[PDB]
Amino acid sequence: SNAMVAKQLSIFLENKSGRLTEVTEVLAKENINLSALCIAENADFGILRGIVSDPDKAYKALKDNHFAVNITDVVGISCPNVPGALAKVLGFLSAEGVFIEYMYSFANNNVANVVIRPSNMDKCIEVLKEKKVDLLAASDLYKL
Amino acid sequence: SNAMVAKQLSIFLENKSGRLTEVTEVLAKENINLSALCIAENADFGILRGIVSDPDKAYKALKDNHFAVNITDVVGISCPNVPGALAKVLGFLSAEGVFIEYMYSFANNNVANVVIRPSNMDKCIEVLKEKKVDLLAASDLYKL
Amino acid sequence: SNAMVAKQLSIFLENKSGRLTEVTEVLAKENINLSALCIAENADFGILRGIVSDPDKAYKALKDNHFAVNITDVVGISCPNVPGALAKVLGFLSAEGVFIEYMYSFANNNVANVVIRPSNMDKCIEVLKEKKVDLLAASDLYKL
Amino acid sequence: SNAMVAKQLSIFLENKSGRLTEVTEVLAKENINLSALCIAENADFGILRGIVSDPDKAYKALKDNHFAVNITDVVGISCPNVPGALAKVLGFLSAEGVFIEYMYSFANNNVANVVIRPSNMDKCIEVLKEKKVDLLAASDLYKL
Ligand SMILES: N[C@@H](Cc1c[nH]c[nH+]1)C(=O)O
Ligand SMILES: N[C@@H](Cc1c[nH]c[nH+]1)C(=O)O
Numbered sequence: 215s216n217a218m219v220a221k222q223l224s225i226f227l228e229n230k231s232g233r234l235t236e237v238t239e240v241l242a243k244e245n246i247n248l249s250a251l252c253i254a255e256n257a258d259f260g261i262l263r264g265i266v267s268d269p270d271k272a273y274k275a276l277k278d279n280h281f282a283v284n285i286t287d288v289v290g291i292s293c294p295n296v297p298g299a300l301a302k303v304l305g306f307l308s309a310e311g312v313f314i315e316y317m318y319s320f321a322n323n324n325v326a327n328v329v330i331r332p333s334n335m336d337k338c339i340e341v342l343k344e345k346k347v348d349l350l351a352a353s354d355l356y357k358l
Numbered sequence: 359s360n361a362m363v364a365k366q367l368s369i370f371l372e373n374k375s376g377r378l379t380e381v382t383e384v385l386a387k388e389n390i391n392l393s394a395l396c397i398a399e400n401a402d403f404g405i406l407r408g409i410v411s412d413p414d415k416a417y418k419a420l421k422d423n424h425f426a427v428n429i430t431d432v433v434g435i436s437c438p439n440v441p442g443a444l445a446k447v448l449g450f451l452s453a454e455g456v457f458i459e460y461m462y463s464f465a466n467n468n469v470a471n472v473v474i475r476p477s478n479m480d481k482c483i484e485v486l487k488e489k490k491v492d493l494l495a496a497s498d499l500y501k502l
Numbered sequence: 503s504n505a506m507v508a509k510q511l512s513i514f515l516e517n518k519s520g521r522l523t524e525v526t527e528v529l530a531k532e533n534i535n536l537s538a539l540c541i542a543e544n545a546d547f548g549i550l551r552g553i554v555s556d557p558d559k560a561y562k563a564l565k566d567n568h569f570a571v572n573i574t575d576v577v578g579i580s581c582p583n584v585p586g587a588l589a590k591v592l593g594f595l596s597a598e599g600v601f602i603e604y605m606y607s608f609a610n611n612n613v614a615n616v617v618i619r620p621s622n623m624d625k626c627i628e629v630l631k632e633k634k635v636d637l638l639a640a641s642d643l644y645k646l
Numbered sequence: 647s648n649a650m651v652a653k654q655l656s657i658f659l660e661n662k663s664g665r666l667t668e669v670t671e672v673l674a675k676e677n678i679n680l681s682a683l684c685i686a687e688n689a690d691f692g693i694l695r696g697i698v699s700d701p702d703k704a705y706k707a708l709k710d711n712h713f714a715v716n717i718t719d720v721v722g723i724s725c726p727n728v729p730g731a732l733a734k735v736l737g738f739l740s741a742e743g744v745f746i747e748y749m750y751s752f753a754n755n756n757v758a759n760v761v762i763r764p765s766n767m768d769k770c771i772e773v774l775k776e777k778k779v780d781l782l783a784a785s786d787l788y789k790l
């Protein structure tokens with residue numbers, strides 16, 4: 215293992231109309247909880263990016279139901295739910311030449327949970343640990 | 359007003375490297391809290407989609423700092439943080455021909471907060487109220 | 503349905519060094535020509551949007567090779583390859599409130615060929631016929 | 647920098663009925679020709695990616711009209727308009743581990759012209775020179 219590196223599902227949603235409901239139905243039937251998701255969409259289709267409670271079980275269920283799914287490495291962090299808090303993290307990263315390809319995040323009461331897909335995963339984790347950023351274990355992320 | 363309809367900022371992040379840190383710095387300086395965000399990215403640029411604590415103040419600060427920003431109507435909902443919970447909502451919508459253009463969401467302890475951009479905003483809100491889905495007031499969404 | 507409407511292939515490229523090559527090798531092995539293509543991408547993977555010489559045959563060959571492939575209706579038009587030619591077409595559409603979701607075009611010597619995916623195909627086609635834009639037959643788009 | 651590399655305009659289209667028309671009218675009013683274009687879109691707005699006859703002049707005119715416009719390096723190539731021609735180019739790149747972020751191409755009678763944005767321009771150009779692919783000078787891409 216790699217510890218703080220989490221598996222994100224990327225799921226190709228064809229049609230529009232449709233398939234997103236069936237995907238959430240596949241996952242419900244397996245008692246797989248969704249922790250975090252974000253759709254990256256275009257005019258015709260979406261891609262569901264997804265943090266789930268059991269990514270390997272979820273992946274095989276989806277393939278079995280004929281979905282196109284890929285797994286991507288991402289890292290979860292927690293910071294205070296106050297103005298400028300995320301700003302401080304991103305400034306640590308950018309000062310070290312580590313850039314965000316995408317991220318998604320919500321405030322959760324007093325903190326905020328952030329999923330990141332960094333330009334360089336080894337370097338990103340290095341900086342964050344160095345700057346004493348709360349990283350989430352992949353397993354913490356899967357049980358939000 | 360329109361009540362449950364919230365303002366989402368969409369912010370054009372040029373470069374890659376960069377500009378996301380400056381945007382979060384603009385917002386920090388105004389003591390504007392981020393509630394929820396999601397980047398919809400391509401190979402060159404991103405678009406930061408953003409739920410903030412004061413969208414009008416945030417919008418004018420960003421324009422003042424020469425960002426390209428647009429506001430979009432979205433609706434926030436809350437459901438249980440259990441398997442199939444989101445599934446039930448989406449099935450209500452799709453049974454009524456209301457489809458999701460995009461959404462993003464995180465589990466927040468015992469519930470989950472979901473931001474939706476529906477195919478039809480008037481119809482989406484109608485179905486959800488009818489099916490007794492917890493909608494979030496726009497103001498609830500801005501203070502997560 | 504509509505007259506003139508052509509089948510665009512949308513192929514999930516699961517990424518980023520062929521998979522894409524593999525698509526093009528599957529089509530070449532079938533003696534299927536690419537007339538036009540463009541990739542709509544995010545940070546992790548792309549969607550190849552393609553006009554090909556036989557879309558049903560390409561579909562089958564790509565499905566046989568386990569690609570996720572969808573079909574989308576699009577419309578081909580021609581206009582003079584001169585400044586202002588395309589602008590003149592776009593103004594017909596935008597004055598009748600016809601939105602463009604996406605399009606792709608290249609100058610081809612004396613004409614430009616443009617593939618359009620409008621928000622409403624019915625209204626799009628009506629306005630183009632009415633304003634006498636040169637619509638392509640699907641089979642003319644396929645033989646480029 | 648590299649030899650052969652051309653300037654692609656990436657224009658924020660803030661949406662979805664011109665704004666796009668307005669871009670094309672700004673360029674036509676400057677007597678600037680579009681050689682190639684494609685829109686990379688999401689549900690709310692698009693990004694127009696364009697090759698034009700004078701990219702610095704188009705940039706200035708679009709900035710003068712308050713568009714958010716960025717410049718990206720891309721590379722133009724030609725290949726025979728026959729099945730397998732493009733596949734042959736893509737296999738050179740993918741065998742040397744060169745990833746394609748996006749590309750767009752149309753068959754132009756006897757050749758196809760392809761605009762490529764690779765993940766690493768240096769390595770891309772090296773492999774194309776070496777394997778003798780027909781690279782376009784920027785000024786040849788601009789005069790299509
Ligand atoms: N509310 C915090 C943390 C946050 C980021 N995203 C969501 N919440 C901020 O403004 O940085
Ligand atoms: N955990 C819940 C709700 C949820 C949706 N997105 C994030 N959480 C489910 O599986 O539906």
Ligand SMILES: N[C@@H](Cc1c[nH]c[nH+]1)C(=O)O
Binds near residue numbers: 616680
């Ligand atoms: N070159 C023509 C038409 C065109 C659009 N795209 C490619 N060509 C113009 O500038 O209007």
Ligand SMILES: N[C@@H](Cc1c[nH]c[nH+]1)C(=O)O
Binds near residue numbers: 539730751
């Ligand atoms: N038509 C050629 C080259 C091409 C790519 N795109 C447009 N044309 C092929 O099938 O390889």
